[PDB]
Structure formats: structure tokens, C-alpha cells
């Protein structure tokens with residue numbers, strides 16, 4: 517089984533991924549995704565989750581006292597705490613494979629300038645913590661990144677959900693003046709494999725020369 | 729002022745676009761986001777959108793006919809057609825800036841093995857097409873990538889290095905103190921400390937950004 521807890525000030529953001537879980541996987545106890553409103557752990561009548569940054573500058577920083585309480589309740593010694601942030605280590609397919617065998621992921625979704633660093637520092641003294649970035653761009657908060665991480669990980673858990681791949685084709689054989697490459701209809705499967713390899717090579721050269 | 733159309737066989741999955749800043753972006757009327765069910769452009773009663781690949785292989789490829797009809801209706805020659813795929817050019821902050829001044833983005837969300845290549849080829853004869861990857865991982869489809877792209881672009885619409893650690897009150901918490909320089913009120917020293925933290929975090933987490941091996 518894998519349990520995923522997501523903590524966010526926008527719990528509705530995560531509701532469609534919850535529903536996208538096949539019933540057969542839930543009934544089999546293979547997966548459970550739970551979403552938690554961070555404001556459940558606020559201390560004041562205004563339900564404050566952020567405050568101005570020490571050292572000045574623009575934006576707001578999320579409060580350590582609120583996050584500390586939330587993680588204290590939700591995390592255990594076995595938890596892998598995932599913190600999506602544009603300042604993180606890169607989240608890659610290798611990461612997704614590694615995390616796919618975890619028993620318990622907690623994903624802490626921050627907003628804007630981030631979560632007070634002492635939250636991660638404190639958590640790391642009693643569980644594993646991973647701050648990660650899903651790409652070289654900035655979003656307004658961690659929620660969309662959490663969706664990407666949840667999907668990339670869970671599709672690698674049985675029954676739950678190099679070079680670039682080249683182009684794919686299906687019927688009809690001719691469409692708006694363009695024919696499917698005849699080699700694909702040749703029945704020469706060694707040649708097809710070689711053709712696909714060359715298409716992959718060319719596409720990787722053009723789009724992702726970093727991979728070579 | 730921007731229009732974003734998303735085409736998908738799971739329109740329900742795009743409802744998170746109504747949350748947070750993208751929700752606020754539409755609430756203020758700076759952007760209009762519309763989500764379209766691809767099955768709307770099917771003509772059989774099974775509403776089939778995919779078929780086995782030519783040349784063999786696992787999985788299913790989305791049919792060009794259904795996609796062609798959808799894009800015929802939704803796109804114009806001014807449209808930027810965006811196709812999220814793990815095989816795309818990288819989507820980066822620079823891309824987000826570039827697309828932030830577009831009048832019309834159409835995001836085509838494929839499933840699994842993807843969309844027949846002729847859809848992009850055909851569209852490219854009348855509009856600009858960009859196949860892009862949001863990162864080096866594989867999803868089951870383009871929907872979550874669409875949400876990422878929309879959020880990254882919308883926050884830039886009018887209207888390098890890694891950021892280091894941030895702190896806020898209280899100055900001591902569970903016996904952990906905010907770095908003293910941040911409490912010192914010395915802007916020059918704080919600027920210098922933050923610059924150093926940024927470069928230090930970048931070397932550790934993203935050495936590629938500074939031209940070092942990963």
C-alpha cells in the first residue's frame with residue numbers, strides 16, 4: 517500500500533486526482549490519497565498561515581508554528597516528506613521510481629516565497645525530507661507540482677492508476693494529404709525498429725541535445 | 729488579455745484551474761480559460777478517440793481525425809498550439825515569459841502513447857505549434873502538464889540562481905534560531921548573506937545552473 521497525505525491551503529485543488537483513483541485499487545487497499553486544509557492547524561481567529569520575511573523584501577513566508585503542528589500530526593518516523601519548490605533538487609523519473617515503493621508520502625504545499633526553512637530542518641531530524649523542483653519555472657504555489665508528483669509516482673505502483681520517443685501514427689493510412697511512413701506498413705519488423713531508432717535519434721538531437 | 733482553450737478527454741481534471749491565482753486571474757477578467765471535451769468531435773456512438781499504432785508497439789494512439797476536427801473549430805492562424813509531451817522541447821521560465829504575451833493558447837492534452845503526429849504536422853501549416861515537456865518524468869496524459877503551463881504563464885501576464893532559505897516569526901522556534909544577520913537590519917550584510925545562500929544552494933542542488941556536472 518501507499519498512503520499520500522497532501523497539506524495545502526487550497527484543498528479543492530487536489531480533489532480531481534482523488535476521484536481519478538480506480539475503486540479497485542482503493543478497495544484493495546493499494547492506495548489512499550488524503551488532502552488536508554493547512555488552516556486546520558492555525559492558532560488565531562484570522563487563520564493566519566503566513567507572515568513577513570525576516571531580513572525584509574517582498575512576499576510572505578509561511579509560518580513555522582502552523583506547519584510544525586500540521587506535520588507533527590500527520591507525519592511519522594516512516595514518512596517521506598516531499599516539499600515542492602522551485603529551489604529544490606530536480607524531480608525526475610528516477611525519483612518517481614524510488615518514491616513508488618514508499619509506504620507514506622506527505623506532500624507539503626507552500627505558497628509563494630516558501631515555508632520557513634526551520635520546518636524542513638526540524639522535520640529532517642526525525643524523518644526523511646526531500647525538497648524538489650518539477651522543472652525550471654516558477655508557479656505560485658506547490659499544488660500543481662503535487663499533482664504532477666502524485667501522478668508520476670502512482671502510475672508506477674502496480675494496479676493503482678537515453679533518447680526521446682519518436683512520432684506515432686494510427687488509422688487512416690492517409691489523412692489530409694499526409695501518409696503514414698510506409699516502412700511502418702512493411703511487415704519488416706527489424707527495419708521498423710531501426711527506423712524508429714533513427715527517428716528517436718533525430719528528435720533527441722533537435723529537441724534535447726542535452727541528453728546526448 | 730489572453731484566451732486559453734484546453735482540449736482533453738478528462739475535462740473534470742482541469743477544474744483545479746479555478747483555484748488560487750489562475751482562478752483569481754479569471755475572476756479579474758485578465759484571462760479566459762475554457763475546457764473542451766475532445767469526445768464532442770466524435771461521430772461514432774462509441775465515441776472512440778484512439779486506435780492501435782501502425783508499425784506495432786504497446787498501447788493506443790489518439791486518432792488524427794477527431795483531433796483535426798476539434799482544432800479546426802477552436803484554432804485560428806493566430807493561435808499558439810501547445811502540445812504537452814515527454815518528447816517535447818523543454819518548457820522553461822523563458823518559455824513562460826514568451827507565452828505570457830500571446831493572445832490565444834490552445835493546449836492539446838494527449839493520453840498515454842500520444843497523438844498521431846500528423847495532427848501537429850497539419851496544424852503547423854496554418855498556425856504555430858510547440859510540443860513541450862514540463863520535466864523529465866512521464867505522466868499518463870497531458871492534463872497535469874496543462875495545469876502547470878497555465879499557472880506558470882498566467883502569473884506573468886501584465887496585470888539563473890536558486891532562492892535561498894526564508895524565515896519569519898518567531899525568531900526562535902523549537903530551539904532553532906533565525907540567522908542573526910537577518911535580524912540585524914543591515915541591508916548590505918543581509919543582501920550579501922542571501923546572495924551567498926543562493927549560490928551555495930545552487931551548487932548543492934542544481935550544479936548545472938552554474939555550469940558544473942550534475
Ligand SMILES: Nc1ccc2ncsc2c1
Nearest residue numbers: 600626627628655657658
Ligand atoms: N512555495 C512555492 C512557490 C512556487 C512553486 N513553484 C513550483 S512548486 C512551488 C512552491
Ligand SMILES: Nc1ccc2ncsc2c1
Nearest residue numbers: 812813838839867869870
Ligand atoms: N500523452 C502524454 C503522455 C504522458 C505525458 N506526460 C507529460 S505530458 C504527457 C502526454
